[PDB]
């Protein structure tokens, strides 16, 4: 059977199970841990946000979800503040979050930080910017550029799972797997990161293991980092990632 790993952390278990029913073995390598951050631990920076800023930008819909949550575990009013900043998602999932809060943006990028930067205004004041523990460096310094004193929210982390990429590397330079799913970004740039060799896992994600990505932003990680996703998903569902590879990969053989 051809064998798929899902380097994925939240959805393991139906990945697993679709895979089984499509006919694959499914390995599971995950590369990332996520955790919460404490309320009281960025309790600060909530109540400088309290305090009403110019600008609002989110990153991810559990971001979003999760700083209104602390602002109501700390007695706080988020809701005015936020409305009346310019509101600015980074993407589709953030923007529903905003939207599902009765704070809709203001404008949406296309997932990435680059598209934000026609989006983002030349102005004064403060712009709070939510992150989910891996720097933003690109956004960062542009909301400096643009004039704004930067106000950091990170309500969550998510974090590379060392040893687990450690497995994950030595399996596919093994020649373990045939194939290896990537649900979001971060886990391609989690891999890149830790590996002893990236140079070698470059090579076997070109050549001897198909890369595939769900999501264009997905894609277009590996892409940076020197790789050609083999098949590329635009839906979101681990049946259509799956059933769509297994007919890329016979419409080849065929």
């Known amino acids: 059977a051809v064998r798929v790993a899902y380097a994925g952390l939240r959805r393991k278990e139906a990945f697993k199970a679709l895979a089984e029913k499509l006919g694959f073995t499914p390995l599971l390598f995950p590369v990332q841990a996520t955790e919460k951050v404490p309320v ?28 209104l949550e ?8 988020l809701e005015g503040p936020l409305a009346k900043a310019f509101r ?3 993407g589709a999932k953030a923007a529903r979050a905003l939207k599902e809060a009765g704070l809709p943006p203001h404008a949406v990028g296309d997932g990435t930080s680059k598209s934000l930067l026609p989006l983002l205004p030349q102005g004064r004041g403060v712009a709070a910017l939510q992150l ?6 690109l956004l960062e310094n542009a909301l400096a550029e ?3 004193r930067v106000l950091p929210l990170m309500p969550y982390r998510h974090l590379p799972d060392p040893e687990g990429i450690l497995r994950l590397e030595e399996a ?16 391609v740039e989690f891999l890149f990161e830790g590996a002893k060799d990236p140079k070698a896992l470059r090579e076997a994600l070109n050549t001897r293991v198909k890369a ?17 996703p083999f098949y590329v998903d635009e839906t979101e569902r681990l049946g259509s990632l799956l059933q769509g590879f297994k007919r890329a990969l016979q419409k080849e053989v065929a």
């Open 132 to 137: 989910y523990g891996k720097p933003l460096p």
């Open 172 to 187: 596919l330079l093994r020649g373990e797997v045939d194939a290896l799913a990537f649900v979001a970004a971060i886990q």
């Open 212 to 228: 595939l990505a769900v999501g264009r932003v997905t894609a277009d990680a590996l892409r940076e980092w020197g790789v050609k």
């Open 88 to 90: 600015l998602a980074r």
């Open 70 to 77: 602390a602002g109501k575990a700390l007695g706080l009013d």
């Open 146 to 148: 643009r004039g704004y």
């Open 40 to 67: 009281p631990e960025y309790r600060d920076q909530v109540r400088a946000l309290a305090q009403g800023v110019d600008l609002f930008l989110a990153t991810t819909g559990v971001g979003v979800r999760d700083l």
